[PDB]
Amino acid sequence: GRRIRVQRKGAGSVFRAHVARRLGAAKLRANDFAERTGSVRGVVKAILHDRGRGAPLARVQFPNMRGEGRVNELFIAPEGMYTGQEVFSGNKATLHIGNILPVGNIPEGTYVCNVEEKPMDRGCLARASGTYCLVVAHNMETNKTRIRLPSGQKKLISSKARAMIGLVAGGGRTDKPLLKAGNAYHKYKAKRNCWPVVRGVAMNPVDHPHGGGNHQHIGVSSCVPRNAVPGQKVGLIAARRTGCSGGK
């Protein structure tokens, strides 16, 4: 049997990210002494379009704290960031959209983005268009803050972990139907070679486990175990339940 498409995709080669002409990695300002004891001030130079990301990315210039120059930082843009906005990063930063403060300071019910999963991680949580985390509770005794992740899961993070106030912009991007195969082609060019997708029932028995008989059928339960080997895991992985049913 041939190495299946998922097996081939992990070997890099043609399935790598189309990262050419991309602005950079969107991350929060590095935790520093003036962000630990005080607030640094930065002006939003430009709101720009990253190639593979629907959400807009904002270039905010901060003073160099270890030199005489200026430091340019690319961040995910929270909705409402304007050219010339004075954002503040630090422990004493005020509660305004676009300011980055530790989430223990941030009151509960606030909508935040680019939250740090762990202290000084530069931001790893709500970064996609229109997404947001919600400050749910503060546990003062453990110095831990519960947040509701975009999937509705709730996680306990450090109170020290920093977050940028505001929904990330580009919201409602998924509502418009792509309409044409064309629009999907354009969007996927910007991201990676993952389109078009051929069903494995359409393929030969050598190419895919679902393979091919005379009647184009899976022929065995699509549900596959969690301990399936790399070629075998092609169906519904460790499905706790299947089918379209109301509830939850």
Partner: protein, 90 residues
């Protein structure tokens, strides 16, 4: 002078793409091409450069916004929360 009775800017897609998709797009694409009032220069010149990026033609101010509307409904609710919560602290 009313060139088409029901389909609006969706007349571009002819008879293809179905009725449901063309109805959703009518609303989505009316918002995308709409001129919105500048939050700064109070002039209806804001237009969408890119998804999530809106620039005032007269104000010259570029603002982060919803993909097809300058302001998303979630975002307006978030702004009201932050303003109230900030005021509660002070």
């Amino acid at each position: 002078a009313k060139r088409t009775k029901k389909v609006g800017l969706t007349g571009k897609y002819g008879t293809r793409y179905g009725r449901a998709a063309r109805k959703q797009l009518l609303k989505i694409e009316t918002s995308q091409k709409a001129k919105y009032t500048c939050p700064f220069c109070a002039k209806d010149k804001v237009r969408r450069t890119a998804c999530g990026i809106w620039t005032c033609r007269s104000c010259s101010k570029t603002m982060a916004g919803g993909a097809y509307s300058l302001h998303t409904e979630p975002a307006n609710a978030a702004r009201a929360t932050i303003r109230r919560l900030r005021l509660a602290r002070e």
